[model samples]
Target: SMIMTVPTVKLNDGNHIPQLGYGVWQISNDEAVSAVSEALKAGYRHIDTATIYGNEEGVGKAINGSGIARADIFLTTKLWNSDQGYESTLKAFDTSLKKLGTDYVDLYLIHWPMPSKDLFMETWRAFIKLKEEGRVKSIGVSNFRTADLERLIKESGVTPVLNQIELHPQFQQDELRLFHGKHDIATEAWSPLGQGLLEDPTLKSIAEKHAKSVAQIILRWHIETGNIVIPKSITPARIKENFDIFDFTLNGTDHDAITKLD
Candidate 1:
């Protein structure tokens, strides 16, 4: 039962992550436990959270209560901006693991480059160390621009398994996707629905044509483009609605129309 209809994306680190995941960014800690438990019951095996979200404990409780094996779930957590130094990162990760009640995370990411501080390089070194020690299955980054990614790779000779960026139809980040493709890095879209841009007439019309909701149309676009998407929702109906997207297909005309909105 852990394996649902949702597909998987093979990370460069030889790990398979569920392409569609549940995100707990703004949800309150008390709300996250029930919300994440509901998601697991609804067939979501992947969960994305951050230490900064202040809900790792809640997420951990949900996972422990869901009756799903830890090995069957693809769980991702991030190191916060303040914990940027090499040793601090390791300590922060231990704190996160303690909060989450997990011995190892499926994936770990540097929350942000904080390019102004110039400490991400050292933070990344700690991440590499964690991966080598099997503290985390895979390592990646978030909110990193091309230059930041290049600098990390060039200096450390270690490529991130994936890059999670703020991507939507309006802000497609086409060039960044191209660069990731060339470098064998996975692309993950954070606000794949364009942050409530689901009300646009273009999306509405497409939704009507496909007999789908506007949110489904937007998420389908991300999936068709091979980008991992994590849409956050606390409502059970919306959670199930977001997961019911593997049955349909968007056409070329739909893509062209959505592309024009860029």
Candidate 2:
């Protein structure tokens, strides 16, 4: 059998993306610069951030601080869950840009689907506008269910390029993945390691069987399943360890058992 390398997926908007990315969610601003710098150093070209994370400035500083050319990095940030209206979304995008010190983002996301907010339609309309204006190259949503995406497309006639969510082996989210397949939406995994769910004894045993770490087994599973994962950590060793999963293969029964997570 042939070994598969890291894959890249194209978005509905015609932008191509690496299927595995480095996520910076919940990493503090104080730590963002160093962590992002480390990730970049570890050969990660795609960096995920959000205004809600309150670390755009630090992330930007890290990118600039990396001595890497701007064109070489794929930078992403999201509109916060609270700022969901058109005007507020615009303001928040600008704020994130200011912190990120960039004229445009490779990808921008509408953070959530809290309908009580009652303005995601307007907010998404603004996202389309931003895309047209070229301030954002690709636009999508996070944590949206099939019905939510359907409602948006039914009303707007424009499909989102991606739907990012808290998916891992434990949560699986196979139905959502199938829905994404139907709509040409790419599925991105926020917690690729199941938010520490890979630490189980069973996963450890599997890791030992493969001579890999539990984290490696889980992340490789994410990449193989076509979900873009953004696993986050501040430690330099862990950062390198996370990115080094490209050298191994998980085949047959081991692959099936890993994929069978709840």
Candidate 3:
């Protein structure tokens, strides 16, 4: 039997989410099957995908055959920017469900707040309907700024449970993070590792101290930083290594160095 050792964070909506998740960002439909299946075999209970990614069918196939019940898995999918309106949001959600071959999704996210289109409000209305009707367990947004968030909550009277943003040690968004904390919204990092930080001298030395890889050190820092991280990888070895982050911890000196990297 498998043991659920990964920690979780309780959202503002009373749902618990796994801190670590596998993100299938650029994997093709055929590639996602073997890749996501490997992640499941590697003991990942959470999976993040999006409609724009165009591989939910493959992701769904991997999960259905992973031998783990859907109840134990946390599946997150997003509503694309083009599908950001009242009826279109609902239609897109149904299509995503059909593509994913699931009755309901654990979490649904507005992929982006397309301000020029001016339709996130309409899209969020449909999201609220989905939540009350018990179709989606949680509703959130991605790539939203503070102004968008303020207006979204003020106008809709519903606060997003989480905001997935481009946050790595190099581009740490402290101001937006503070906003999320004040509103009890969880901050999730899409790219937890910066592009070239893997080769940094400081990170390499820290890895040496822990006898781990640079990726492990960065992931460990994210764990300690309390930001939910989903690092994308299609390789089996890297997928397994990414999930193997809970066994180590970082110290104050390491944290200070990473903070300076921001």
* Backbone Cα, N, C clashes tallied per candidate: 0, 1, 0
Best by TM-score: 3
Residue-level lDDT of model 3, residues 132-238, one tens digit each, is: 99999999999999999998999988999999999887899999999999998999999887695988888888999898899999988888878888889778999
Clashing pairs in 2: 170-262
Write down the TM-score of every candidate.
0.96, 0.93, 0.97
Off by over 4 Å in 2: 1-6
Report the lDDT tens digits of candidate 1 across residue range 12-120.
Answer: 8889989999988877888999889988988899999999989999999999778889999899999999999899999999999999998999999999989443699
Candidate 3: which stretches are off by over 4 Å?
1-4
lDDT of 3 at 37: 94
- CA lDDT, every model vs. true structure: 0.91, 0.85, 0.91
lDDT of 2 by residue, 79-159 (tens): 877888889888888888888998999999888887543588888988999999999989999999888998988999989
Summing lDDT over every window of 10 consecutive residues in candidate 2, give the lowest-scoring window: 1-10
Candidate 2 lDDT for residue 171: 90
Instruction: Return the TM-score for candidate 2, rounded to 2 decimals.
Output: 0.93
Model 1 misses residue 74 by how many Å?
0.6
Name model 1 segments beyond 4 Å from true.
1-4, 115-117
What is the overall TM-score of model 3 with all chains considered together? Answer: 0.97
